Scaffold this active site. Structure first.
Site, short mmCIF file in Angstrom:
data_model
loop_
_atom_site.label_atom_id
_atom_site.label_comp_id
_atom_site.label_asym_id
_atom_site.label_seq_id
_atom_site.Cartn_x
_atom_site.Cartn_y
_atom_site.Cartn_z
CG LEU A 1 -1.69 1.31 1.45
CD1 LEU A 1 -2.51 1.68 0.23
CD2 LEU A 1 -2.58 1.19 2.68
CG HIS A 2 5.04 3.08 1.92
ND1 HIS A 2 4.89 4.41 2.24
CD2 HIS A 2 6.35 2.93 1.59
CE1 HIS A 2 6.04 5.03 2.11
NE2 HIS A 2 6.95 4.15 1.72
CD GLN A 3 6.82 -1.21 -2.44
OE1 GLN A 3 6.83 -1.44 -3.65
NE2 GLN A 3 7.25 -2.08 -1.54
CB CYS B 1 3.68 8.22 1.75
SG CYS B 1 4.90 9.22 2.64
CG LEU C 1 -0.96 5.01 0.05
CD1 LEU C 1 -1.00 5.03 1.57
CD2 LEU C 1 -2.20 5.67 -0.53
#
Length: 178
Positions: free
Chosen positions: A29-31, A166, A33
């Site tokens: 999810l982070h990458q 993020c 965002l």
RNA sequence: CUGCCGUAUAGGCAG
């Protein structure tokens, strides 16, 4: 504004325990965002066990109809779409309490604190001078595995203006808890 | 874990 959400469940795995799976997921999810950009994508853990210090097996993704519809349209779930069970995006129910899902960091490894103290005040001198659910991540820049601690805030009747990092964590924003 | 912000052995951040 963020009246839309989407639950993602970690399908039981013979070799990888849930905790390990949620790590991978959150990283994924982070990458995505940092690809989507913006600060309007929230995140909560409905199956949060405030006692056992476990995040649970569910990751609720908060966002508006457009923002949410734009996220999941990316290939950020390619690697583990077979490890994740998830429905459609729906609208959050009401009335819904609000709370903050934010990162938490304590002070420790005094070897670290002291090192900085020495830098800012010019080992013998320096040497003299948290129970929460955590996700373990791996940095892109230095290949270090670090524990990102997460805490769900006290329930509130409303939501104050605020954004998100993020990592989808609280930058001051609130998310509907249900 | 590593680092940043801050006089801070205040309170905060980044990955």
């Amino acid at each position: 504004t963020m009246d839309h959400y989407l639950d993602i469940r970690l399908r039981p795995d013979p070799e990888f325990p849930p905790a390990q799976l949620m790590c991978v997921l959150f990283g994924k999810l982070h990458q995505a965002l940092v690809a989507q950009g913006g600060d309007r994508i929230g995140v909560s853990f409905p199956d949060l066990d405030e006692s056992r210090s476990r995040l649970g097996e569910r990751l609720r993704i908060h966002a508006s109809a457009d923002d949410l519809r734009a996220l999941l349209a990316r290939p950020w779930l390619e690697g583990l779409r077979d490890h994740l069970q998830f429905g459609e995006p729906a609208v959050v129910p009401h009335p819904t309490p609000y709370r903050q899902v934010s990162r938490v960091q304590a002070k420790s490894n005094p070897e670290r604190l002291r090192r900085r103290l020495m830098r800012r005040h010019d080992e013998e001198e320096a040497r003299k001078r948290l129970d929460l659910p955590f996700v373990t991540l791996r940095s892109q820049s230095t290949g270090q595995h670090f524990r990102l601690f997460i805490r769900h805030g006290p329930l509130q009747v409303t939501a104050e203006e605020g954004g998100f990092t993020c990592y989808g964590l609280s930058k001051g924003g609130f998310v509907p808890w249900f």
